[PDB]
């Protein structure tokens, strides 16, 4: 399709997609000798992403910034493995995201989930300690002056997770929105909600993002770059699809169903797209946790 760029390589004059479209790392050319990465992927893609990077960046000491939307295993798993190869990089993440990398228990979950995605006999590169990453915490509303023609604003966008932020390039009307709009359904052209922490926060974030100046390019955590009406309408549509799922959950619960029936239907209808980076039972469990969250906020009793 023409409204979705979903191939590795060059996406715009300044922008390349590294790695797998399903868990991409984005490469921004900031100047003649300066680059940034956006999104932090899964650990097992370290050598894939590195090889792709080296196709575009002759000297990786020119990679100066690495922007991170949130702490989930599939958005920061590359950091320990590529940061030793990027001597001048500064990781830019929210305060809460940074705190996750200081917690043994949080780091433990991230490593376990990423380890489950290793192909057999696959070994990972030498790693920076999670608590020694070259991180700089960024605040809600902070302007990131990455280069002469790259200025991106940090926007808090909690709900999917309690630490989640997005990055807005107003010059290009380009939003790196992470998972705050959900998972874009490639077969059907709609957003699938990913409400894994707080429903009211998730919806309130979408309300705020809808108020941004009209988007030309919308870049979530998975699936590539969206443009035209998909970008312009994305935040509003994601909001609408979340309400649709809430109503659906209430309809079925009013028929006496347990959360497990719609959980299984959601896993059936939606689990295929992420199967290669969501190990084992995590998708079905993610659907369950989402419906639990929605049920607590929206159930009448
Ligand atoms: N793409 C997904 C589809 C279903 C469940 C979770 C995800 C994630 O993307 C993981 C996450 O970051 O929360
Ligand atoms: Fe996430
Ligand atoms: Fe994700």
UniProtKB/Swiss-Prot annotation:
UniProt note on regulation of activity: Thioesterase activity, but not pyocyanine production, is inhibited by 2-(pyridin-3-yl)benzoic acid, 2-(1H-pyrrol-1-yl)benzoic acid and 3-methylthiophene-2-carboxylic acid. Compounds bind to the active center.
UniProt GO MF annotations: hydrolase activity; metal ion binding
EC number: 3.1.2.32
Positions annotated to bind Fe cation 1: 70, 72, 160, 179
InterPro entries reported in the protein's UniProt record: Metallo-B-lactamas, NDM-1-like, RibonucZ/Hydroxyglut_hydro
Matches recorded under Gene3D superfamilies: Ribonuclease Z/Hydroxyacylglutathione hydrolase-like
Alphabetical keyword list: Hydrolase, Iron, Metal-binding
Consequence recorded when altering residue 183 to A: Strong decrease in kcat with S-(4-nitrobenzoyl)mercaptoethane as substrate
Disruption phenotype: Mutant is defective in pyocyanine and rhamnolipid production and fails to kill worms efficiently, but can still produce PQS. Deletion mutant produces increased levels of DHQ, resulting from intramolecular cyclization of 2-ABA-CoA.
Function text: Required for the biosynthesis of the quorum-sensing signaling molecules 2-heptyl-4(1H)-quinolone (HHQ) and 2-heptyl-3-hydroxy-4(1H)-quinolone (Pseudomonas quinolone signal or PQS), which are important for biofilm formation and virulence. Catalyzes the hydrolysis of the intermediate 2-aminobenzoylacetyl-CoA (2-ABA-CoA) to form 2-aminobenzoylacetate (2-ABA), the precursor of HHQ. In vitro, can also hydrolyze other substrates such as S-ethyl-acetothioacetate and acetoacetyl-CoA, but is inactive against anthraniloyl-CoA, malonyl-CoA and octanoyl-CoA.
Protein name: 2-aminobenzoylacetyl-CoA thioesterase
Species, as recorded: Pseudomonas aeruginosa (strain ATCC 15692 / DSM 22644 / CIP 104116 / JCM 14847 / LMG 12228 / 1C / PRS 101 / PAO1)
Originating gene: pqsE
């Amino acid at each position: 399709h023409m409204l979705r760029l979903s191939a590795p390589g060059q996406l715009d004059d300044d922008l390349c997609l590294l790695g797998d479209v399903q868990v991409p790392v984005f490469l921004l050319r900031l100047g003649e000798a300066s680059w940034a990465l956006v999104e932090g992927g899964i650990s097992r893609d370290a050598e894939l992403v590195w090889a792709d990077l080296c196709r575009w960046v002759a000297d990786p000491s020119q990679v100066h910034y690495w922007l991170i939307t949130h702490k989930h295993y599939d958005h920061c798993g590359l950091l320990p493995y590529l940061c030793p190869r990027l001597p001048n990089v500064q990781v830019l993440a929210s305060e809460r995201t940074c705190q996750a990398w200081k917690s043994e228990s949080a780091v433990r979950v991230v490593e376990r989930l990423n380890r489950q995605l290793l192909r057999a006999e696959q070994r990972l590169p030498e790693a920076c300690a999670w608590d020694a990453l070259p991180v700089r915490a960024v605040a809600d509303g902070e302007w990131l002056e990455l280069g002469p023609r790259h200025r991106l604003q940090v926007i808090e966008a909690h709900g999917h997770s309690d630490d989640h932020v997005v990055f807005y390039d107003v010059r290009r009307r380009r939003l790196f929105c992470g998972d705050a709009l959900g998972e874009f359904d490639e077969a059907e052209g709609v957003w699938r909600p990913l409400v894994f922490d707080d429903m009211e926060a998730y919806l309130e974030s979408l309300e705020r993002l809808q108020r941004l100046p009209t988007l030309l390019q919308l870049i979530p955590g998975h699936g590539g770059l969206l443009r035209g009406r998909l970008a312009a309408d994305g935040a509003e549509s994601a909001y609408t699809e979340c309400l649709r799922l809430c109503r659906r959950l209430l309809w079925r619960q009013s028929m006496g169903e347990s959360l497990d029936e719609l959980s299984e239907e959601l896993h059936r209808a939606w689990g295929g797209q992420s199967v290669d980076f969501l190990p084992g039972e995590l998708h079905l469990g993610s659907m369950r946790r989402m419906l639990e969250i929605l049920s607590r906020q929206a159930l009448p009793l």
